[PDB]
Amino acid sequence: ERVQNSNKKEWNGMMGELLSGQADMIVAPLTINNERAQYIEFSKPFKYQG
Amino acid sequence: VGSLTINEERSEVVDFSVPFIETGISVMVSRSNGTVSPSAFLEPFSACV
């Protein structure tokens, strides 16, 4: 989400936490888009789903 | 670019990208003709009446 402080854009939630180093491994039922994959290394997709 | 997956001895030698499609291991059989239903569907049901 775009922060209103002259064009900063910051990930929120766990994505903010892992990017700020508060977390190291993110195990979650989370899908994979290009947007999160722009910065964050992903493992192999474990549970395939729709 | 061939349609191949990995096992643990492939992945040490070969280096996949992200998997684009998902598949699995199945068996193939054929059809039967009919089913079993030994004339007893409402027989415990109607036994209450």
Curated annotation (Swiss-Prot), chain A:
Residues reported in the UniProt entry to bind glycine: 29, 31, 36
Localization, UniProt: Cell membrane; Postsynaptic cell membrane; Synaptic cell membrane; Postsynaptic density membrane
Taxonomic superkingdom: Eukaryota
Glycan attachment residues as annotated in the record: 4
Tissue and organ distribution: Detected throughout the brain, in brain cortex, cerebellum, thalamus and olfactory bulb.
PTM note: NMDA is probably regulated by C-terminal phosphorylation of an isoform of NR1 by PKC. Its phosphorylated state is influenced by the formation of the NMDAR-PPP2CB complex and the NMDAR channel activity.
Described function: Component of N-methyl-D-aspartate (NMDA) receptors (NMDARs) that function as heterotetrameric, ligand-gated cation channels with high calcium permeability and voltage-dependent block by Mg(2+). NMDARs participate in synaptic plasticity for learning and memory formation by contributing to the long-term potentiation (LTP). Channel activation requires binding of the neurotransmitter L-glutamate to the GluN2 subunit, glycine or D-serine binding to the GluN1 subunit, plus membrane depolarization to eliminate channel inhibition by Mg(2+).
Subunit structure: Heterotetramer; the NMDAR subunits are modular and harbor tiered domains that function in concert to regulate opening and closing of the cation-selective ion channel pore. Forms heterotetrameric channels composed of two GluN1/zeta subunits (GRIN1), and two identical GluN2/epsilon subunits (GRIN2A, GRIN2B, GRIN2C or GRIN2D) or GluN3 subunits (GRIN3A or GRIN3B) (in vitro). Can also form heterotetrameric channels that contain at least two GluN1 subunits and at least two different GluN2 subunits (or a combination of one GluN2 and one GluN3 subunits) (in vitro).
Family: Belongs to the glutamate-gated ion channel (TC 1.A.10.1) family. NR1/GRIN1 subfamily.
Entry comment, domain topic: A hydrophobic region that gives rise to the prediction of a transmembrane span does not cross the membrane, but is part of a discontinuously helical region that dips into the membrane and is probably part of the pore and of the selectivity filter.
Protein's name according to its UniProt entry: Glutamate receptor ionotropic, NMDA 1
Source organism: Rattus norvegicus
Lineage: Eukaryota, Metazoa, Chordata, Craniata, Vertebrata
Residues of the full protein shown: 488 to 537 of 938
From Swiss-Prot, chain B:
UniProt PTM comment: Phosphorylated on tyrosine residues.
Location relative to the cell: Cell membrane; Postsynaptic cell membrane; Late endosome; Lysosome
Protein origin, superkingdom: Eukaryota
Tissues where this protein is expressed: Expressed in the hippocampus including the dentate gyrus (at protein level). Detected in adult olfactory bulb, brain cortex, hippocampus, striatum, thalamus, superior colliculus, with much lower levels in inferior colliculus, midbrain and cerebellum.
Glycan attachment residues as annotated in the record: 33
Residues engaged in binding L-glutamate: 5, 10
Summary of the function given for this chain in its UniProt record: Component of N-methyl-D-aspartate (NMDA) receptors (NMDARs) that function as heterotetrameric, ligand-gated cation channels with high calcium permeability and voltage-dependent block by Mg(2+). Participates in synaptic plasticity for learning and memory formation by contributing to the long-term depression (LTD) of hippocampus membrane currents. Channel activation requires binding of the neurotransmitter L-glutamate to the GluN2 subunit, glycine or D-serine binding to the GluN1 subunit, plus membrane depolarization to eliminate channel inhibition by Mg(2+).
Subunit structure of this chain's protein: Heterotetramer. Forms heterotetrameric channels composed of two GluN1/zeta subunits (GRIN1), and two identical GluN2/epsilon subunits (GRIN2A, GRIN2B, GRIN2C or GRIN2D) or GluN3 subunits (GRIN3A or GRIN3B) (in vitro). Can also form heterotetrameric channels that contain at least two GluN1 subunits and at least two different GluN2 subunits (or a combination of one GluN2 and one GluN3 subunits) (in vitro). In vivo, the subunit composition may depend on the expression levels of the different subunits. Found in a complex with GRIN1, GRIN3A and PPP2CB. Found in a complex with GRIN1 and GRIN3B.
Domain text: The extracellular N-terminal domain (ATD/NTD) endows NMDARs with a unique capacity for allosteric modulation, harboring several binding sites for small molecule ligands that act as subunit-specific allosteric modulators of ion channel activity.
Family assignment from sequence similarity: Belongs to the glutamate-gated ion channel (TC 1.A.10.1) family. NR2B/GRIN2B subfamily.
Descriptive protein name: Glutamate receptor ionotropic, NMDA 2B
Species for this entry: Rattus norvegicus (Rat)
Lineage: Eukaryota, Metazoa, Chordata, Craniata, Vertebrata
